[PDB]
A and B are shown apart, each in its own frame.
Chain A
Amino acid sequence: FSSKTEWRVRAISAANLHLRTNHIYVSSDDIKETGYTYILPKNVLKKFICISDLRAQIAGYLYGVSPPDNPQVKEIRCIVMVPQWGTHQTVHLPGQLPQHEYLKEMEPLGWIHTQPNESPQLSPQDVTTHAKIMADNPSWDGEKTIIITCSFTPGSCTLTAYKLTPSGYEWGRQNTDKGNNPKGYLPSHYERVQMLLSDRFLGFFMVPAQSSWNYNFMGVRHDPNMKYELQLANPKEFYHEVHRPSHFLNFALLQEGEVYSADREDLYA
């Protein structure tokens, strides 16, 4: 991005992203009936969407529960934002898993993300990402963790939620290269499953206790070895002045600029 012009054109894009979130589309296809069905609050999908970009992908982490004596439904009752920068193609979010006494009450449901372009398959990045998380953290369980995409379609949203097959997780932790066309990447690696919306309960938001989630514009402070805290606070919008300190720190004058036109009428307050 041009860093000045692509800066504004997408900032004035972003100013009405809430337009979409009364136009989302739900993933309806053949059901497994033996797996889970993952139910998400409408308003946190709202916020998770309006905070995003329509080219830069962001990802959130689902925390939530199973209800007592109703196992195979997965309530998504909280979403965590971690520090990250994403590309327009995927999301890059550090290896540190969000831990909390808040996140104690819940099991990690997996990961969900924005998507600019409509793609009726799992993004290779997504499959290898869930894999690579499986590779170092047994906290996620294969029968329990899923990969959501939510594309920004023409003024609308269209979301789907997938789960990996065994060879799916296998090839994912196999792959290293970062092209959308990794050899040995095939539609054998995922399975799309039942996700539902909810006005039925309330999800809540998680934000780092000290920092942001959109290091998108600071390619400097984000490192796969960097570490972060968390809190229940609201993700501020993609471009809010916290995540853009350089240009808000871009001021170049010589301070006696007040020399010119010194007629000084106030008379008020």
Chain B
Amino acid sequence: APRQVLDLEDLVFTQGSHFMANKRCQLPDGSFRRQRKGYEEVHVPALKPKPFGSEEQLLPVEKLPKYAQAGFEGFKTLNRIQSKLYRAALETDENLLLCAPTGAGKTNVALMCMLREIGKHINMDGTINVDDFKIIYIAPMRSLVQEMVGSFGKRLATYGITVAELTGDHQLCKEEISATQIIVCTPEKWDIITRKGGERTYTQLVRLIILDEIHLLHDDRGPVLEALVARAIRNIEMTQEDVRLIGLSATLPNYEDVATFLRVDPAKGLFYFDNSFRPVPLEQTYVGITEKKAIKRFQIMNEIVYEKIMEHAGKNQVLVFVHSRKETGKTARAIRDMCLEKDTLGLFLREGSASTEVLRTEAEQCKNLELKDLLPYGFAIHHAGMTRVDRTLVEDLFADKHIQVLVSTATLAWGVNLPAHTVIIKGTQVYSPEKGRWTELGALDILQMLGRAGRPQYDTKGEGILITSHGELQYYLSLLNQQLPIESQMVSKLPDMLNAEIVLGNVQNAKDAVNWLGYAYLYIRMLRSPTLYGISHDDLKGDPLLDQRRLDLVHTAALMLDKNNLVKYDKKTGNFQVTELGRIASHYYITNDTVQTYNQLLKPTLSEIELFRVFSLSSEFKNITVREEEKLELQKLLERVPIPVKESIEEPSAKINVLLQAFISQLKLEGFALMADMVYVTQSAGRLMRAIFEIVLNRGWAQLTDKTLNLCKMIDKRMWQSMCPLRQFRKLPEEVVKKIEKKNFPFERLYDLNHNEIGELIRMPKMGKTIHKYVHLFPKLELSVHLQPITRSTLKVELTITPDFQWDEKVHGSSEAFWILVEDVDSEVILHHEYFLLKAKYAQDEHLITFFVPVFEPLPPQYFIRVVSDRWLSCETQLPVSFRHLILPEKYPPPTELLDLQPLPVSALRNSAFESLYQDKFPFFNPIQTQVFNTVYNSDDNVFVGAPTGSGKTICAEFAILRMLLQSSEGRCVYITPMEALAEQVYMDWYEKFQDRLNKKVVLLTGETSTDLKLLGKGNIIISTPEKWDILSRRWKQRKNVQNINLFVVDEVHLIGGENGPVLEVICSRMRYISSQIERPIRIVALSSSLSNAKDVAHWLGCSATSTFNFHPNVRPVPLELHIQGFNISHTQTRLLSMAKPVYHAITKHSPKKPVIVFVPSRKQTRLTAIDILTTCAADIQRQRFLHCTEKDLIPYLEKLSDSTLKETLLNGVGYLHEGLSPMERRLVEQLFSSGAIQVVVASRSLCWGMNVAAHLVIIMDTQYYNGKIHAYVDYPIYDVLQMVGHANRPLQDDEGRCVIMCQGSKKDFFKKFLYEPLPVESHLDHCMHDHFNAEIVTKTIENKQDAVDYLTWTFLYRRMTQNPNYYNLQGISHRHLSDHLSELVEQTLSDLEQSKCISIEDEMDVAPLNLGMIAAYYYINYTTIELFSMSLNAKTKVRGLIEIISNAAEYENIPIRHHEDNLLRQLAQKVPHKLNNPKFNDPHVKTNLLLQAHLSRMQLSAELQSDTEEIL
């Protein structure tokens, strides 16, 4: 039914993993319970060896898989469990579950369980090579992570499989963590990783997970593991790919629900074992203290410890695990004084005086701590509190067995293993700062430590003793005796996991949430024990599969999430929308209460004064409270901070705020509780800081964001801003550091000091070497800028990032990660902010960063650019970018509104032979064409039509074509359109429109000039491209059939701004020159997209204001539903992969019933995207939703394919479109789609032009594309946006259209702002100037600087550079300033031309072409490339040198370097017979030389590269 409210507190377990979920226990066989004074004694004798199975023997290390035999060297025999498990491991991918108490070492069986896939990825002359598999070992303790990764990395090193730990940061370790093979990790680290979304990238090669010691699920920390288990199970059920599963837990019941939740089979995926097979028999003693008074207990416990020490005084060994670092060494020397004040009783515990080598611990005296004093005694102490080298130095004697009493910590036990005759758990309790009080230390800790009782060789049967409390020592017994159930404690965190999956997209609605609960253990566990978790059997029967109680659960998640604004979820829709709050929660593992706490506290003008309270108020430290004890040093911590603390006084608030202060200040603290809580709160404070940082970097609070990044970096350095910039380098000596610090000398001044000129002040002349070394190893970047106003609203800024540093790997790392901000004048309004990373490989290279920023009516005198290294503290780079020169662009006037005139049909024109070519197509012409008609068809003057992509100015050009045809039979028409494929499709339709129906032939320009001149003049309408119509008629006066063209149309000339526009602009100025000088009138037509500055272009082509059709994007037949999706992970791979579900779900929302055309980022990524689409159809049960026909219908057109997966793709109804698709395959797919048998087509960014298949929805994915010359990605072209966004054109049936574009947040506002209003366009012949002036000088069209100015006087540059000059580098907008700029550029270009020997400028006034200019403008190649040619040409020419000479051409500078082509290219240059002088792997010139060698060898590379080969041919 409808949602049901739930209170989740009283239904989750207090004292997690200390519950003892089952409330009855049973003693062991030899168990004895005895009463003493204040102490009850529970003893248990060790069980019997389970007998040798009937010819069940250990498997030899040879007898097993020889391939897995790598790395276990020296191990000749197998453990009993090892042999029992090897068959299951090496024979089965059965989801494994190893149930064995501490001592079985199931790590070595998980070894073969992984070695299955480790051998699965191997070859003959090659190895396991890691391009196939990496398995993740989830371990609960960082000590276990360390020891396991260390031992295993060198163990399997014989096979050389990379064993690494997932302990690096997200971007800091993603590169080197990609080449990290089967890896250990903390489940918590993996949880943060999978919440951020980086885990998907290393996924789908993620073969296997091992879950070592899954008993942690009994804790409250088990919730993370439960989330991971549900995630893996559920997402593997949708991926249909398996995931190999190893599970591990100690001897415990409920193994069947364990195997259930692990998808492990009890059939053979189970490994269950009793505790009698302990290779060291396990004798137990437990001392429960009924003592009320902790006072008397604090003595009696030490007394019992002294008794137990007397028990092992002789030939024996004890290891005592204490709770505190100080109390450890305090518990020792208590034994010393005890054996001293009992009159040498129990001491003399050697073989005599010096026998049993008392001289070992005698000759070993000198140690850093006071353990030097305990070494003269029989006792010793060891911990990483004492030291790290000393820890190994004491374990040395412990392995020498020359210390009979070892006092240590639980972490030193759980670390590197050393076993003991006796184990002593001293108190079993710890001070939980999360609980802020005392409590028990959970199961697995005691498990590890009290599993060290007994050694693997050095004894037979080990005993151990745990001193605990009366009420709980029973649970302590039920823990080691496998009466201990293990439940789940996610029940409180459930809403957080729901938030997490909603952010990950793994749950859209409560339905997916319940499907995810289906892979949860709480399903199986709450089932098998319903009465326990609050499920009455009556309501259980009422809801047998518990969907309704699972949705009453879900109710609390939805309610709390909407209440905390981590999701925006409705009562009826059943789905939820997550926001920035839920995003930050997921990405930073932020708790949904602290998230609303931040949303409530954080304001724009936050100072550190209030940030202290805001950081101490964080709900993460809720149950940490100031003790009566601390209240003295509380004022002491207040009296030391550079920040004021009057905000709060002695309380939790003060405690946490001052504690953070001290954590930064590197402060001492007396109390152990003080130090513990400080450690914990500060550990949480780092993530808290990064979360507040995300919030502030989103909402835009500038000063708060600066302070927050600095505060994060500060707690990182463990130093405030007050430590010298030499603090970021721990390599400095502190004395010299403080000497250079004490002066008032800016660290931003140090670089002008030479090797010794730095020490010349500090009186440190001999240290100057390392001084300057660090002074330059300090990360430093320099930056320069280019500016241009695009619109009066928002200008664009282009960046240059050069290195002022010298990089080094242990100092820099793999990359320099910097947050840059485009910020208001006063640093208040955050206009933008980007995050960049320039790799060490990518170092020293300026990377083109390009962004726009807005301005307003009260214009500011400058903006600011901020650059800050992410973690580096005291690192900064400023750039005040000045607007003091701005020339505010011309407000382009209002466009012509669409007058609602009578619907004009094809019965408008009187000619029936014309009306025929429309009659059988449409009912009426759209009012755009129908208002432009009376000009284009009924008038001869110059007509201009500016219409957004899909409004049909091509039909109004066809109206002018009709007018020309009616005016003159053999009239000649020029159709100059830049787009080669669109123009090809236009000529293809014209060849049938006119040659067939009207019998007037159509001509299509091709390469060879003579046959092209044959085409024109013979054809009535000649279609061509910009340079296609520049090359021919660059000498037009010589050509007779050129001056005899009646009509001329510039189709889609708005591409003038974009590339290939300058050639068309020059040729159109030449057309205007024809219509001026030819003494005849030539009809001029200009078609463009939505245009703001339309009138200037209209005049520059010679059109009237009455004739220039300037219309808004709102004027089109098909209205739009336009959507933008901002993706927060700017990493190309991670973005492209994690944004998969969004496109199919955008279908399921907007166009689940109509055509979808999905533009993708790569030729290969189209495939991957279509595959992910079909896979998301599989999960979203509606399968074959794209198929609009029968299965045997597909075979008739599926008989023609070469791609193997394209057949199944067609059976799924998706289909691809790319350069790889053979022309027939592309046409066939297009045919099925245009018929409507196909629904959703994976189309390339390269196929965005030449398609005839429009759509209802057009979905753009990954607007960035990767270019190799600069080794970086770029944004998609604006004209590409226009074209592929117009590609949704179904005015035939669809009453509107659907457009979707999912790009970065940077390119989100880009489209949102540059799409709705029109686009501006400038001319760039100002940049490429040699070409047109060269052609004119060789034609004698422009023979003198006067003539060059006259030629420029008819261009669109003349108009626009005079209109908004500074964008064209003109600082003065006047007439004389225009002349100045024009004649100056003329002087410079003609001077550079003559200097390149292009032509001779006589007297500096006249000009006359030379042989250079002649041959250059003859071969239509750039004059600068011809200059490099003239520098290459020598008398001793051979084809070998000349090949590189003529391949270095800028005419081959269009061939790009594509995604990761550096190795294959060197392999191909290897198999080509000509080498290269330092062959460059990012030079398309070396690429072209290798390709010409391929052309000479007839060696068949891929067709991808053969495209470039043939193009260069």
Q: Which residues of A contact B (CB under 8 A)?
A: 4, 7-9, 11-12, 14-15, 18, 43-44, 47, 78, 102, 199-202, 204-205, 210, 218, 220-221, 231-234, 237, 241-242, 244-245, 247-251, 253-255, 257, 259-269
Contact among A14, A248, A254, A269 for B192, CB-based, below 8 A: A269
A262:B385 contact, CB within 8 angstroms: yes
Across the interface, name the chain B residue whose C-beta is closest to A262: B385
Tell which of B189, B639, B646, B675 touches A268, judged by Cβ atoms closer than 8 Å.
Answer: B189
User: Chain B nearest CB: distance from A92 CB in Å?
Assistant: 19
Query: Assuming A248-B721, A249-B722, A251-B722, is B880 touching A233 (CB within 8 A)?
Result: yes
Given A205-B826, A260-B675, verify A12-B647 contact (CB < 8 Å): yes
Q: Kindly count the residue-residue contacts between A and B in the assembled complex, taking CB atoms under 8 Å apart.
A: 140
CB pair A245–B647 under 8 Å, yes or no, is: no
Q: Is the CB of A261 within 8 A of B723?
A: no
**A251 and B411 form a contact (CB under 8 A):** no
Chain B 619-673 interface residues, beta-carbon cutoff 8 Å to A: 639-640, 642-647, 665-669, 672
From the candidates B167, B744, B826, name the one contacting A221 in the complex (CB within 8 A).
B744
A contact residues around B826 at 8 Å (CB): 43-44, 47, 204-205, 234
Q: Is the CB of A250 within 8 A of B859?
A: no
- Does A260 contact B687, Cβ atoms closer than 8 Å? no
- Given contacts A14-B609, A260-B325, A261-B675, 4 further A-B pairs with CB under 8 A are A11-B644, A233-B878, A251-B722, A261-B385
Alpha-carbon distance A63/B719, docked complex (angstroms): 40
Given known A248-B720, A260-B675, A261-B672, contact A269–B644 (CB-CB < 8 A):
no
**Which of A9, A102, A244, A265 meets B642, CB within 8 Å?**
A244
Is B1199 among interface residues, defined by CB-CB distance under 8 A?
no
Contacts of A266 in B (CB 8 A): 142, 683
Contact across chains for A8 and B644 when beta carbons are under 8 A apart = yes
Q: Is the CB of A253 within 8 A of B722?
A: no
In the complex, which residues of chain B have a beta carbon less than 8 angstroms from the beta carbon of A233?
878, 880
A218 to B744 CA separation, bound complex (whole angstroms): 11
A44 to chain B, nearest CB (A): 8
Q: Are A261 and B676 in contact (CB under 8 A)?
A: yes
Task: Check if A267 sits within 8 Å of B642, measured CB to CB.
Answer: no
- Complex Cα gap A102–B709 (Å): 31
In the A-B complex, list the 8 residue pairs whose CB atoms are closest, starting with the nearest: A248-B722, A8-B644, A262-B385, A15-B609, A261-B675, A267-B186, A11-B644, A267-B188
Across the interface, do A263 and B189 meet the contact criterion of CB distance under 8 Å? no
Are A210 and B746 closer than 8 Å at their CB atoms? yes
Across the interface, do A241 and B722 meet the contact criterion of CB distance under 8 Å? yes
Please, how many angstroms separate the alpha-carbon atoms of A216 and B542 in the complex? 76
- Chain B positions within 8 Å of A250 at CB level: 640, 642, 722
Give the residue name and chain of the B residue nearest to A105 (CB).
B884
Instruction: Please report the C-alpha to C-alpha distance between residue A220 and residue B589 in the assembled complex, in whole angstroms.
Output: 48
In the bound complex, residues from chain B placing their C-beta under 8 Å from that of A234 are 826-827
Task: Judge if B409 is at the interface, Cβ distance under 8 Å.
Answer: yes
Asked if B169 is at the interface (CB within 8 A of a chain A CB), the reply is yes
Bound: A181/B1211 CA distance, A: 98
Complex Cα distance A102/B884, Å? 9
Of the A-B pairs whose beta carbons lie under 8 Å apart in the complex, a sample of 22, sorted by A's number, is A8-B645, A11-B609, A12-B646, A14-B607, A14-B609, A15-B609, A43-B826, A78-B861, A200-B858, A202-B859, A204-B861, A232-B861, A233-B878, A245-B744, A251-B667, A253-B666, A255-B734, A257-B667, A261-B679, A262-B383, A264-B142, A268-B589
Find the residue from A201, A218, A242, A261 having the highest chain B CB count within 10 A: A261
Shortest Cβ gap from A195 to chain B (Å): 20
Chain B residues with Cβ under 8 A from A199's Cβ?
Answer: 858
Contact status B324-A249, CB under 8 Å: no
| A251 and B383 contact, CB distance less than 8 A | no
Residues of A contacting B741 in the complex (Cβ-Cβ under 8 angstroms): 249
CA gap between A241 and B707 in the complex, in Å:
11
**What's the nearest-Cβ distance from chain B to residue A233, in Å?**
7
Alpha-carbon separation in the docked complex, A255 to B720 (Å):
16
Chain A nearest Cβ from B724, distance in angstroms: 9
Query: By DSSP majority rule, is chain A's interface helix, strand, loop, or mixed?
Result: loop
Contact of B256 with A by CB under 8 A: no
Q: Shortest CB–CB separation between residue A171 and chain B, in angstroms?
A: 38
Question: Could you tell me the distance between the alpha carbons of A142 and B167 in the complex, rounded to whole angstroms?
Answer: 69
Chain A residues with CB under 8 Å of B668's CB are 253-254, 257
Interface residue from A14, A200, A268 paired with B188 (Cβ < 8 Å): A268
Interface 1/0s, chain B 127-160, versus A by CB < 8 A? 0000000000000011000000000000000000
The docked-state distance in angstroms from the alpha carbon of A39 to that of B818 is 41
| Bound CA span A185–B81, Å | 102
Nearest-neighbour CB distance to chain A for B707, whole angstroms, equals: 10
Q: Please, which residue of chain B has its CB at the minimum distance from the CB of A242?
A: B721
Within the complex, the shortest CB–CB distance from A76 to chain B, in Å, comes to 13
Q: Kindly provide the distance from the CB of B866 to the nearest chain A CB, expressed in whole angstroms.
A: 11
B1106 contacts partner chain A, Cβ-Cβ < 8 Å:
no
CA distance A200 to B645 in the complex (A): 40
Residues A241 and B642 in contact, CB atoms below 8 Å apart: yes
Once the chains are docked, how many angstroms separate the CA of A9 from the CA of B644?
8
Shortest C-beta distance, A210 to chain B (Å), equals 7
Point out the residues of chain B lying under 8 angstroms from A44, CB to CB.
Answer: 826
Q: Which residues of chain B from 674 to 698 have any CB-CB distance to chain A below 8 Å in the complex?
A: 675-676, 679, 683, 687
B409 near A263: Cβ-Cβ < 8 Å? yes
A78's nearest neighbour on chain B, judged by CB, is B861
Q: CB distance A204 to B744 under 8 Å? A: no
Asked if residues B609 and A245 are in contact (CB atoms below 8 Å), the reply is: no
Residues of A within 8 A of B645 (CB): 8
| Contacting residues, chain B, for A237 (C-beta < 8 A) | 607
A204-B861, A221-B744, A263-B411 are known contacts. Are A12 and B827 too (CB-CB below 8 A)?
Answer: no
* Chain A neighbourhood of B644, CB < 8 A: 7-9, 11-12
Say yes or no: A245-B675 contact (C-beta < 8 A), given A234-B827, A260-B326, A267-B189: no
- Nearest CB on A from B666, distance (A): 6
Complex: A242 Cα to B1249 Cα, angstroms: 57
Select A247's contact among B192, B324, B722, beta carbons within 8 Å: B722
Are A247 and B642 touching (Cβ within 8 A)? yes
Query: Closest approach, in angstroms, between the C-beta of B673 and any C-beta of chain A?
Result: 9
Per-residue A-contact encoding for B1446-1482, CB less than 8 Å = 1, 0 else: 0000000000000000000000000000000000000
Q: Which of B167, B385, B669 has the most CB of A within 10 A?
A: B385
Q: Among B721, B734, B859, which residue has its beta carbon within 8 angstroms of that of A241?
A: B721
CB pair B142 A251 closer than 8 Å: no
Name A248's contact: one of B642, B687, B859 (CB within 8 Å): B642
Which residues from chain B contact A245 at a C-beta distance below 8 Å?
722, 744
Q: Which residues in A have their C-beta under 8 angstroms from that of B609?
A: 11-12, 14-15
Assembly CA distance A234 to B866 (angstroms):
13
Question: B170–A251 contact, CB under 8 A?
Answer: no
* Residues on the A chain within 8 Å of B354, using CB: none
Q: What residues of chain B lie closer than 8 Å to A231, measured between beta carbons?
A: 880
B residues less than 8 Å from A12 (CB atoms): 609, 644, 646-647
List the A residue with the shortest CB-CB distance to B665. A251
In this complex, what residue of A is CB-closest to B880? A232
The answer, yes or no, to whether B862 is at the interface (CB within 8 Å) is: yes
Q: How far is the CA of A204 from the CA of B859 in the complex (A)?
A: 11
Which residues of the partner chain B approach A261 to less than 8 Å between Cβ atoms? 324-325, 385, 672, 675-676, 679
Contacts of B169 in A (CB 8 A): 269
Which residues 1397-1440 of B have a CB within 8 angstroms of A?
none
Which single member of A8, A204, A257, A268 contacts B860 (CB below 8 Å)?
A204
Select the residue from B409, B672, B722 with max chain A CB neighbours within 10 A: B722
Task: Say yes or no: B687 contacts A268, CB within 8 Å.
Answer: yes
Instruction: Report if B605 contacts A (CB, 8 A).
Output: yes
